[PDB]
Amino acid sequence: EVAALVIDNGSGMCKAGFAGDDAPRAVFPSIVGRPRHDSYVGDEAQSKRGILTLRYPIEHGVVTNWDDMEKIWHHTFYNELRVAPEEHPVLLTEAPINPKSNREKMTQIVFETFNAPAFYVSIQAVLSLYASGRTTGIVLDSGDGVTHVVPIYEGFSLPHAIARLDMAGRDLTDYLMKILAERGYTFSTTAEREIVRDIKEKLCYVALDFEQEIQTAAQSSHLEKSYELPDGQVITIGNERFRAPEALFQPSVLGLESGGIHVTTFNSIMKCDVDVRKDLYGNIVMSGGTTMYPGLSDRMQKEITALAPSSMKVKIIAPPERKYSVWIGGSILASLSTFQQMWISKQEYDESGPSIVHRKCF
Amino acid sequence: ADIYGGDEVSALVLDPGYCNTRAGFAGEEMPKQVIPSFYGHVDGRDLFGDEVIVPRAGFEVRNYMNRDSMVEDWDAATRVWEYLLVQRLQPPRPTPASKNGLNVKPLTENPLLMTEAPWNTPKAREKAIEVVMENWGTPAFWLSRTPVLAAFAAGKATALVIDVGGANTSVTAIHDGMVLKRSIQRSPAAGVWLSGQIRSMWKSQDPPVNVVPTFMVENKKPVEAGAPPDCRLRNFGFPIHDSFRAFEEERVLTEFKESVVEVWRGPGKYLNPGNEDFAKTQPGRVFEFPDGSNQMWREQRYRVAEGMWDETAAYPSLNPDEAAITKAQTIPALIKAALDGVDVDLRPNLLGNVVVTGSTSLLNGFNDRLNHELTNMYPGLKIKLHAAGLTSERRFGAWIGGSILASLGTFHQMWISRKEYEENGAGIVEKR
Amino acid sequence: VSERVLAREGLERTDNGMRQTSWPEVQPINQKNYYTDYMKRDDQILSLRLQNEANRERLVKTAQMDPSKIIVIHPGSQNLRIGFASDALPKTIPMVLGTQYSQTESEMHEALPRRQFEGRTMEQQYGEEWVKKYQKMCSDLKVTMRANKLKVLPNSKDLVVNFNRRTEPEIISQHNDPLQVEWTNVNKAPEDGTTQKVFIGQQALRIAEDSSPKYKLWWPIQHGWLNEDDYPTRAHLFDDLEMLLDRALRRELGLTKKADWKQYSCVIVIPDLYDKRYVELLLHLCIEFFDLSRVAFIQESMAATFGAGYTQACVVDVGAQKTSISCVEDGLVIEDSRVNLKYGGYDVTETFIKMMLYDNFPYQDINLRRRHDFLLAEELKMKYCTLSQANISVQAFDFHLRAPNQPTRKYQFKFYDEVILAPMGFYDPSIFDNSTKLRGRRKLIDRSYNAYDVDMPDDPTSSAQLAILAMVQPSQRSAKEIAAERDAVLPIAPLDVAILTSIQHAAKGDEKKVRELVGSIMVVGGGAKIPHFAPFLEEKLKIRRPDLADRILVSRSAREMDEQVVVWKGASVFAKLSTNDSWVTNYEYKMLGSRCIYMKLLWHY
Amino acid sequence: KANQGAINAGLRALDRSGKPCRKWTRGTFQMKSFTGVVWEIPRWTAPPRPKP
Amino acid sequence: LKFQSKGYNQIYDQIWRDLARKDVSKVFRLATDSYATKASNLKKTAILASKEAKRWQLRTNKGTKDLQARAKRVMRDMMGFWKRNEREERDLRKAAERL
DNA sequence: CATGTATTGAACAGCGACCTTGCCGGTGCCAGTCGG
DNA sequence: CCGACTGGCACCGGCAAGGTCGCTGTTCAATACATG
Ligand SMILES: Nc1ncnc2c1ncn2[C@@H]1O[C@H](COP(=O)(O)OP(=O)(O)OP(=O)(O)O)[C@@H](O)[C@H]1O
Ligand SMILES: Nc1ncnc2c1ncn2[C@@H]1O[C@H](COP(=O)(O)OP(=O)(O)OP(=O)(O)O)[C@@H](O)[C@H]1O
Ligand SMILES: Nc1ncnc2c1ncn2[C@@H]1O[C@H](COP(=O)(O)OP(=O)(O)OP(=O)(O)O)[C@@H](O)[C@H]1O
Ligand SMILES: [Mg+2]
Ligand SMILES: [Mg+2]
Ligand SMILES: [Mg+2]
């Protein structure tokens, strides 16, 4: 008998696949394009940009344009997965502390637009913790659009202790354009920006000692790696390589007043009950695409060890799948026998309304 | 008939205090959003949340609440409550289309119930509903006192609430969910005063102890007890303001409060002849300041707290104008005065239903000592202490009470309607 | 009181048609006899699903892959082998990367072999322990070669020492110098499709000492592991192994246009006792940095038997700095058999120079961290070292020290027994400088913990290796602490003892498996190319286990190949053959990182 | 794994059959305080399911 | 004007007394029990989920046996490859450096 | 041409260990009946 | 609205029981290889 579906509603990239699978079937940009003067989604919308206004329907991890979001799910089911929701239960991920109204509205849409039989909404941080191997820990989830720190104890995510660094993978791309423009290259265009995001994904890393790297970058040849544009001209970038990710650790470097990921991790831990903190320092878990920079774990280990009491073991769990951990945890959850007595049935929706999600999903 | 779904009313419950402010939707076991009441100021620009306090040239740390646990800066109160109830708990408005890099009134849904300190004066209650009705378009409003909600967070209709806050320690008798007005008793001997005690005690050990806050250390290495710390401190392109340093040091005083200090729990006060001499021999508790400065703490661990139980024990204030605590402002004096403000016939019922509340009650041994003190000051009566809360986390007791109150279907008849306010102006006094 | 008076006043209590409460009521889950559908079928595991899709598509194309588009890489502390799977022999380059820097590698550290210059006596100058051990080994050889009834003139060492002391360099230039030899012109631009003036391989060694901009050489691999001793930071090390392999693709294979690389596939050979962090680094280079379509891993001894065509063998790999032993049977390296010793043909060179220096080798100023001295030392090692206890006598020879921008100096010299004692260090490894091999061994890159239980080490462990560690340091602590305590010991043992402790753990107590493996010894790796290494090792094994002396049989290389290339040739066969479904595809790795190595490899990773 | 009886109650009982769920809409509700004054809360509604 | 009435006082008090004694106590019990059950559900679920996430890595006899077979398949094929290059025809790529 | 074999890759059958919830004897706290 | 007394349900540790799962084992047609 046929499997349930798992959809990860990313600010940057949407991911979808069948429960039980260990990786998504479909990964495509969360872009909807409508004519300037039909609509297109994902790579098509980027390709046909010349005749389209493009908008993201998800901003800072949260859905903001429902009429567009419904088109992304339509593309997900009918073009990407090639399966009709009328025969499959669905698990949707959502960002931590998203508004109640958004839980209700996405409940409304996968019943009333897609006639899905039974469905469940799930906190992205928690799922990334399941995929990371454990029941208790603190999840730094850092995506394209937003960065959250979420303490979770005995599989319950503490809402009050969540801290949101409003800065993430797009900001680091805007920033890497900025510092390369200062170096001498031109990258103002959207068809240039989508090159710079690839440059960020390949060449960047996080320094273990930022001041020492700045001091030695003035003389080292090794640092200055080079990258071919589609245009055929070749760029070279140097201290830009680490100054782009370093903004995670020093958001002043790109001009906002929030504390870095390390201080926000520490503050989230410190907002927890004293008895729990031993376990959270022992179980820091990294999630989401922005956490993929080489050596982010080593620097998180260093920085939090500098903030923590010298008695605390500090442990940074960075699984190799951490780019898709949010989806993978969903896969797992939607493929336990237990799921059936945990979802919203259409028979419940039909007499409870969208507000059933506030009972049933917790 | 039977056209409606599974939902009643998505109320949200707001709970301001001197140290912290708490907000979120009714019918959840914890508030969604808890923030430092202390708010950032930089350059005519106000900043909120513990993620947005950091060293910057202009940075100054204000608070919209005074040490009476009442609002003193209603403009900032409006901005803070709008950050909680609007920016963090409602759907975002989408970006304009050009600005996304690809191309090249708010509370009408949710009634607001708000928490007030027991002694909060009518003028401040009037201004609360006035601010609410202008600024967010809210459909209905209600205002209720922390003791009443704290009792509901323990499940008790009638209770003695001991409420050991930050800026204030309070005792009050709750009966059938009303406060018995004569019983309200209040004291500075609370988590803020206790920080001053700890500061004083540090500035008076044989080598003086210097707190240095977490933000000023770049790197630290472990060191043996009482050694000079292997560390390197920061420097900045600007002076750090005194308000900022004071706020960032309070974290360390909170860490010392929670992980070291311990209420004297043995028989009799700490200053009875044998007790101090005994305490000096015991295994203590260890602590680390952010500097790396490591020490084992033996007998002071009790004394810093003991002053709120017997003023005789208290250290002198570091601020010379912060006058010493009177006998009448010690916890047993509060308790005895509070209960003596209540009908003699009701006293056993209250004492059987003791509710403890507030983060300062999370001192090790606080329930022990309070059980002893209640026993010895009211002999021949049963005593049973309860924490406010549904969980180990007894921090949120006032809030959780609101969450529960606004979820009771019987309650929704009580709200001050938008339409009542816009017809009467000061309903808030008499409809209570 | 009052009753209907309340209603007349307009005051009336009211439930508002609401429920008695709105607090969530939650039904408890039941998990009795629970089941899971997660990763239960090949359909669901991405690494297998993609392979089934590739199998189906191959069957369809058959009804109606290219060795020239498979690259085979085999890294090493002195040498990198690289080539296409089509190719008869791999191109070999010194795995060294040269860059502009403030100080050359000779200026940063004490000279090698290490000496206490201006020491109070020559016995202190070379270290007293070491001098006693050299004297032992000289006497041991004299007794041994007298037992074999060779000629020994009593004055042998004196004839060498006095001659080497009294002789002085001749000086030659122009057509009097046999070679008009070049130095790398670091000023000239790279024509191989790139901007940065960096050099690899033989050309990097041939950078003059006083080049106009100063160049420092770096080796990213030493002692058969990542060379964290030298590198300031992790990123700088990764960036150099990336830069070296990048230039090797460009400058040896001639794949100059980078955009074409996405259509190629790659086979990487890794040691039998690998660090997981080194395997996962090499994967990540091959996919995020080079964007190659497929990557596959084969273990050095596994590959060695694929180079021979052996079902079952004991493979002894004697590298420049690593010697490793493991026993192969039924398509796997036997997990517990693996032994990994931190010595090889470089130690023989250092030791060879140090023994001649102590005797009286003319160029006392020599320093193996200086490039032309390094090449000198290595050339002499390859010519004069021999484990054959024969044709050994006072012999006179000469070499040229073609220093950079300085006249060619020719030294006559003599040797007697340093030429055999230095190699024989493989049977008393204390004679080697092992003092700093363990230096910085976890300075940058931590030990490989398990993905989820991050205390627990997840590197390979082998009973045979622990037997070797116990011989150096006799051996409730956590598994982390135990692994740390083991890493603090440098694995060292005589080569015969290492082989027999390998084989005993391969057999797990079965004389018949012992009698097969001991009769099946195959020697590979360049250190093995010291003349008569295989027969000498057969002798040493015979005399430690007389119970096996009729079956013990050692063979050099396989099927006429050079010892160096066998493992490469084998890894090419694993590229070419059709049954191999071991490939990590590029799309797998993008989706699931190193997790897919566990799903795909042909052993328990 | 999947079978009959308990432990698969939901996976047997789910609808799978395309039929429309009842359409919800953001209606309103008249709420009456104990002081008799009436005020409006936004509340979900759907059309009545038919007679047996 | 509005709220000084004895009647108002009675209803206000009666609402609050019933709300405090009956409804707050019912809802307290229900909320505490509901929290305990929610926490239990999530604990139970997280324990299963976290086991599954790791389960693929645990060695099994069947997994071991099939892996040994995959190795042995490849090994026989490798012997076949050499048979097709030494027995089917002697097809060695003899080569020299020609320096 | 085409006799003859142990092993292969797999479907199918068998057994005990395992995790979890039901039913159980018992201690305890509680809502409700009754009198006032 | 209130307390004393009663029958009842919540909770404790404990043993009996369930199916899933992993370990164990027999049997089949098809295979590469050998003598013949
Ligand atoms: N290997 C990588 N190195 C660096 N950055 C990466 C890497 N892979 C992806 N990213 C970046 O991570 C972001 C995408 O991550 P992810 O898909 O988790 O975001 P998302 O979930 O859509 O965002 P959000 O969680 O905010 O909704 C992009 O900015 C992308 O460029
Ligand atoms: N674990 C702890 N142990 C003791 N004191 C603590 C602990 N955690 C926090 N505190 C202190 O108690 C106060 C926390 O705020 P709390 O809710 O208890 O009071 P508040 O409601 O913010 O202020 P108030 O009621 O006085 O207006 C602070 O003074 C804080 O330093
Ligand atoms: N012709 C030769 N004769 C003798 N010895 C040689 C010859 N050529 C090289 N060697 C020696 O053999 C050593 C081993 O070379 P090889 O290329 O196997 O190193 P390697 O495989 O990189 O070692 P490792 O893999 O452990 O780093 C060389 O370092 C050199 O000292
Ligand atoms: Mg995401
Ligand atoms: Mg308070
Ligand atoms: Mg080698």
Author numbering:
A (entry chain V): 4 to 40, 51 to 375
B (entry chain W): 13 to 116, 139 to 466
C (entry chain U): 5 to 68, 101 to 511, 618 to 747
D (entry chain X): 148 to 199
E (entry chain G): 720 to 818
From the paper:
INO80 is a >1-megadalton chromatin remodeler that is conserved from yeast to human and emerges as a central multisubunit enzyme complex that determines chromatin structure around NDRs/NFRs. The Ino80 polypeptide itself carries the core ATPase motor activity and acts as a scaffold for the three modules. The A-module is highly conserved in evolution and contains an HSA (helicase-SANT–associated) domain (Ino80HSA) in the middle of the Ino80p polypeptide chain, along with actin (Act1), Arp4, Arp8, Ies4, and Taf14. The INO80 remodeler specifically places nucleosomes at the boundary of gene regulatory elements, which is proposed to be the result of an ATP-dependent nucleosome sliding activity that is regulated by extranucleosomal DNA features.
We used a subset of two-dimensional (2D) classes in our CtINO80 dataset (ADP∙AlFx and apo) that showed well-defined A-module:DNA complexes. Using extensive 2D and 3D classification, 3D variability analysis, and refinement, we classified and refined two states that differ somewhat in the way they bind DNA. In a second state, refined to 3.4-Å resolution, additional protein DNA contacts result in binding of ~35-bp DNA that exhibits curved conformation. In both states, most DNA interactions are formed by Ino80HSA, consistent with the robust effects of Ino80HSA mutations in the in vivo analysis. Additional interactions are contributed by the N-terminal extension of Arp8 and by Ies4. The central contact side is reinforced by a “hook” element of the Arp8 N-terminus that binds to the DNA backbone as well as to two minor groove base pairs. In the case of curved DNA, we also observe DNA contacts around SHL-11, mediated predominantly via the HSAα1 region and a helix near the very N-terminus of Arp8N. Binding of curved DNA is noteworthy, as it might be influenced by DNA mechanical properties. Geometrically, it is a result of the curved shape of Ino80HSA at the Arp4-actin pair, which is incompatible with binding of linear DNA along the entire length of the A-module. We also find that the hook element of Arp8 widens the minor groove upon DNA binding and could contribute to DNA feature readout.
